[PDB]
Amino acid sequence: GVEGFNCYFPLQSYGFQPTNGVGYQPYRVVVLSFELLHAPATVCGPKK
Amino acid sequence: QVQLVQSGAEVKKPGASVKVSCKASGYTFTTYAMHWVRQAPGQRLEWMGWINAGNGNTKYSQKFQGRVTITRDTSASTAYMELSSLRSEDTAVYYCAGGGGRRLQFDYFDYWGQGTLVTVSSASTKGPSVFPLAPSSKSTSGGTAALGCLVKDYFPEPVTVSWNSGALTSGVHTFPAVLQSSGLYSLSSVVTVPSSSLGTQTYICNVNHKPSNTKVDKKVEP
Amino acid sequence: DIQMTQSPSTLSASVGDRVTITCRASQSISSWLAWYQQKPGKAPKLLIYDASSLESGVPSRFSGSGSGTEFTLTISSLQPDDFATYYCQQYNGYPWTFGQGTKVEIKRTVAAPSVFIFPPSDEQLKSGTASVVCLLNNFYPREAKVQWKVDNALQSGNSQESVTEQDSKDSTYSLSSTLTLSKADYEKHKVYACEVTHQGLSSPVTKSFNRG
């Protein structure tokens, strides 16, 4: 909880500027997860 | 509820520097966002800059680049502002804003300080001159006539005015101040009464200019 | 830099009604905006952010909309606490700007002014500058005009206008016109007149006097 030599703040920052290149653009990422278990499933959404 | 409070009024002179500061009171300091903005009177608001009450980051404006600075004190949980090379324009009211809370940064001001008044002048403290505003029977309107108590060439903005020390409340009117070419302020206050009680009553305005401690009264002679 | 202009400089209404505000941007904004309420002599209070969201602790009446450039605020019923200006803030890019100000009022049948003039006081005549006061009280539509006529001539530049703020109980407006000049001009002139043009008045009205 102090700033000085041998002390480093953990939260850096992105400088997301449109003038940047493709390599430094920002990306919105979303990630899903699925698993198989005992009790009968609920999230179905099958065919038509 | 988060609240922000800060210093009182200031008066300075061209070329000087001024330091306003506001103290915070928030439930957590999750990279808090003290964030300054100013308002010339009767004008568009203008945005100063944002200090990263988390650590030290100091993004500033561009019209105000190279002459304004901002810091904060962790233990006192206050925010410090500093401006130099002032000039007659920057006469304004200065504000503290910020305080996201849920997320760490925004760019919208959701907790506002109650305002700080800064006046850039070249004059100095001076008492107010007072003159009565006598009506005439020419303009007897519905048996009612107007009457006032002018104040000219005085210094700051408080100029409290009252009539017979609160004895009168009806129809009172107190206009806002106006800057002059000479750099001095001036005010006019007025009120109307039924003309029936003109010659039989006693009305005296009551002015208090604290920055010069003067208290002046003037009976109006019709 | 991003420019922000507000389409209505002023807005009329009456209690229990709906109003709309337009905030146009010189460039494209991706629905980054907020709406602030500022009563006179106080500190701004926020209402809407991200152009849609309703921030907590506010009446449910307020509601944002819009995207791209043209943006809109709207309230269903007009409560008393709605009587103040409203600003729009962009935050699409750097240096963040603000609007112009969009101020509401309390509509009522137009009230015509009562005109008054005051000659300079002789004590002021001792000092060395001359002051003349032309007064207007309880007149309805702010947007008025006052001109000074001295020795049957118009006068410019040397006049200052100060207008009160509308009273809650009174719900009208009051105005003072001040004419200032140096003594040498004073006695040089014989007759003084301020003239006012008002919507409520049938005709332009002149009030005047001369020395003594």
Side-chain angles (χ1 to χ4, degrees):
Chain A
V2 65
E3 285 84 12
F5 79 103
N6 297 355
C7 334
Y8 319 99
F9 198 83
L11 303 194
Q12 212 154 330
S13 62
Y14 292 111
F16 284 145
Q17 319 182 40
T19 62
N20 295 148
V22 298
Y24 273 11
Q25 307 266 356
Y27 270 83
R28 310 173 106 176
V29 170
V30 58
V31 56
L32 279 77
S33 55
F34 320 107
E35 50 264 24
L36 318 185
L37 271 300
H38 290 77
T42 8
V43 207
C44 254
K47 19 248 158 355
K48 291 120 252 323
Chain B
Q1 323 94 140
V2 167
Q3 290 210 18
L4 277 297
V5 286
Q6 79 292 12
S7 55
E10 291 66 20
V11 54
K12 297 296 188 71
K13 70 192 55 73
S17 300
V18 66
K19 197 177 169 71
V20 295
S21 296
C22 53
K23 175 193 170 50
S25 50
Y27 88 105
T28 53
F29 263 56
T30 62
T31 318
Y32 207 70
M34 286 329 278
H35 191 189
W36 285 94
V37 73
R38 82 167 189 159
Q39 166 184 235
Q43 281 263 296
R44 171 181 285 173
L45 305 194
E46 201 46 20
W47 171 88
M48 281 295 178
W50 58 280
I51 188 54
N52 193 355
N55 63 34
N57 294 272
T58 48
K59 178 72 176 184
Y60 287 130
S61 306
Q62 287 298 109
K63 270 87 162 180
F64 294 169
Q65 63 84 30
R67 98 200 195 183
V68 61
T69 58
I70 297 169
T71 60
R72 84 292 185 277
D73 186 74
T74 303
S75 182
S77 65
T78 77
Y80 282 13
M81 204 283 263
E82 182 65 26
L83 177 56
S84 286
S85 303
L86 281 73
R87 185 178 296 113
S88 72
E89 69 275 16
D90 284 345
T91 55
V93 178
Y94 285 60
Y95 277 124
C96 292
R102 284 311 151 191
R103 283 151 310 260
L104 62 84
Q105 165 85 50
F106 298 112
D107 198 49
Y108 56 80
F109 311 164
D110 62 358
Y111 285 136
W112 285 74
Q114 52 74 10
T116 311
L117 174 47
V118 173
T119 311
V120 171
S121 160
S122 54
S124 294
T125 299
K126 185 195 157 296
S129 299
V130 192
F131 320 95
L133 278 300
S136 83
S137 58
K138 280 185 155 75
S139 187
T140 295
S141 182
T144 69
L147 188 153
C149 182
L150 172 44
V151 166
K152 284 289 308 310
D153 291 331
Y154 78 96
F155 192 56
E157 308 176 11
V159 265
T160 299
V161 164
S162 57
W163 286 86
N164 294 357
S165 289
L168 291 84
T169 50
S170 181
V172 61
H173 271 320
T174 56
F175 292 163
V178 55
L179 172 62
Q180 287 153 267
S181 303
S182 62
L184 288 88
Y185 288 174
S186 64
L187 181 153
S188 68
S189 80
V190 72
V191 67
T192 182
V193 298
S195 303
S196 49
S197 56
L198 183 63
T200 185
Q201 294 320 120
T202 310
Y203 313 150
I204 297 169
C205 56
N206 321 116
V207 65
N208 301 22
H209 195 325
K210 263 73 176 176
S212 75
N213 297 115
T214 69
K215 293 87 188 173
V216 178
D217 292 331
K218 285 186 73 170
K219 159 66 171 63
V220 62
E221 162 47 69
Chain C
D1 190 74
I2 297 315
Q3 289 62 72
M4 202 66 28
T5 57
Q6 305 198 226
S7 299
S9 178
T10 180
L11 200 51
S12 297
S14 298
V15 57
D17 186 74
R18 77 207 311 282
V19 298
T20 51
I21 298 104
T22 302
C23 179
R24 188 150 313 102
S26 65
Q27 309 305 321
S28 63
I29 296 189
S30 310
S31 71
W32 303 128
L33 187 152
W35 291 100
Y36 301 122
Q37 179 176 214
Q38 172 184 359
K39 280 191 168 304
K42 296 291 171 307
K45 178 179 180 180
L46 180 143
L47 288 180
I48 301 299
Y49 64 92
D50 293 353
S52 179
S53 75
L54 185 67
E55 190 276 331
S56 73
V58 309
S60 302
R61 313 180 302 264
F62 299 92
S63 62
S65 60
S67 176
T69 50
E70 281 216 70
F71 293 158
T72 301
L73 192 159
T74 300
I75 62 170
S76 74
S77 174
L78 182 83
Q79 298 302 125
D81 291 331
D82 292 331
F83 295 147
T85 78
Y86 295 98
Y87 293 60
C88 58
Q89 180 180 2
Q90 70 94 3
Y91 52 93
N92 189 359
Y94 278 171
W96 293 272
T97 60
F98 277 68
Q100 303 304 60
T102 286
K103 66 185 289 184
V104 304
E105 59 89 24
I106 320 176
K107 182 169 53 260
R108 199 67 273 178
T109 306
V110 279
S114 310
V115 183
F116 291 93
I117 297 170
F118 294 65
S121 68
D122 53 28
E123 293 83 4
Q124 171 57 80
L125 294 174
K126 286 187 46 50
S127 64
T129 187
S131 299
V132 178
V133 171
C134 185
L135 191 146
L136 305 172
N137 189 359
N138 297 115
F139 64 92
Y140 178 76
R142 204 266 313 269
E143 37 275 348
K145 176 54 71 73
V146 178
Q147 69 275 18
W148 287 91
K149 192 72 176 295
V150 167
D151 289 10
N152 298 20
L154 286 198
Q155 283 79 28
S156 57
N158 80 89
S159 179
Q160 293 82 17
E161 209 190 326
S162 182
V163 65
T164 184
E165 188 36 65
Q166 186 175 14
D167 177 75
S168 299
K169 186 262 185 180
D170 192 334
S171 77
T172 60
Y173 291 80
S174 290
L175 173 45
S176 63
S177 179
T178 180
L179 201 160
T180 179
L181 60 94
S182 72
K183 296 294 188 290
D185 291 331
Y186 183 41
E187 69 275 15
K188 186 263 183 183
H189 295 89
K190 180 67 174 66
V191 69
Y192 299 138
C194 62
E195 206 286 330
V196 65
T197 68
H198 182 243
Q199 166 200 358
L201 265 291
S202 60
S203 170
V205 167
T206 309
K207 195 53 62 63
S208 68
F209 64 91
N210 79 24
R211 277 177 278 158

